[PDB]
Amino acid sequence: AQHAVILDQEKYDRILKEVPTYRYVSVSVLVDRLKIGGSLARIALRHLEKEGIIKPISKHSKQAIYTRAT
Amino acid sequence: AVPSVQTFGKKKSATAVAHVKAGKGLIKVNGSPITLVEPEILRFKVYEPLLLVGLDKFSNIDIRVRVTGGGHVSQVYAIRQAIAKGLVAYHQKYVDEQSKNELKKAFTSYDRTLLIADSRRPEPKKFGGKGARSRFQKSYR
């Protein structure tokens, strides 16, 4: 494919351990962990926000910023 | 037999006519509340005349702003100025010059367009250029 950007239901399990203990979370960080690429990074952020491991500080389109759950 | 003063504020071809009248607190722009101005960052440029003195001073008036001309930013600066100039013109005429002084040096302490329009105007275009200065490229050889 293109540097580990593949659709998976196991890297769901990889995400939901690796994403917490991040001081900062955004599309840029998710992709720069050689994970899910862009389209999949955004819908990962949206599901992590529904689940409530993420606190959204700002949610502007094109630049969504997030933090670890208190 | 009602306190009513028609003021205007302007920034580069943007005419914002405010109508500050004796009322409760109805501050509205193009028949919509100030809380809905097109640029959502310039929400705090239209608002700053209220946050400068306090909403307690606006607890006994109603303002209606009609904006025409310019672009989005020109129109926000026009509203901001029109509201501040409206409020000081009301306080001058219907309260006293003491409280007018008070909120004049309140408004001009935090730096101003706000009371009197920036003098700046566009310079006309002259031949052999794409603007007032920028000349076309020169071809020696």
């Binding site: - | 193009n30 028949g31 919509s32 509340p33 809905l36």
Partner: protein
């Protein structure tokens, strides 16, 4: 207690009126939908393509409300954007006629828009009622 179409935000209103006009199967779809890009000067069709139309319908409703009387020409030159003419400088080519005409006809049949004197189209009294009802719900849904 006097919430109108103007008292509510632009997008946050149109999105709730989009939900409402989709729940109701009352407003028509011209049939050529899925094969149009609502312009002469665009690249690709509307990305949603699940009847956007319910967003045009909503916005032409909200626009004709705020204005006095709007014609198809005002809607075309409104919705039309900058056409990339290739290597030549960008222009203004106005949006597609049929979409804006057939959505006005769809509002006319539903009873939102009324064929108005001075030409063009005004809002119906049923139109103002339905718009203001949604406009009140939108705000109190958050509150």
């Amino acid at each position: 207690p006097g919430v109108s179409v103007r008292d509510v935000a632009a997008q946050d209103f149109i999105n709730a009126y989009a939900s409402f006009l989709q729940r109701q199967g009352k407003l028509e779809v011209p049939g050529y939908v899925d094969i149009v890009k609502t312009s002469s000067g665009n690249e690709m069709p509307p990305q949603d393509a699940e009847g956007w139309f319910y967003k045009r319908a909503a916005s032409v409703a909200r626009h004709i409300y705020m204005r006095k009387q709007v014609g198809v020409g005002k809607l075309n030159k409104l919705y039309g954007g900058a056409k990339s003419r290739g290597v030549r400088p960008y222009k203004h080519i106005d949006a597609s006629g049929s979409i804006n005409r057939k959505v006005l006809q769809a509002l006319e049949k539903i009873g939102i828009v009324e064929i108005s004197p001075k030409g063009g189209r005004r809002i119906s009294e049923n139109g103002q009622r339905d718009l203001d009802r949604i406009a009140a719900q939108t705000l109190e849904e958050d509150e």
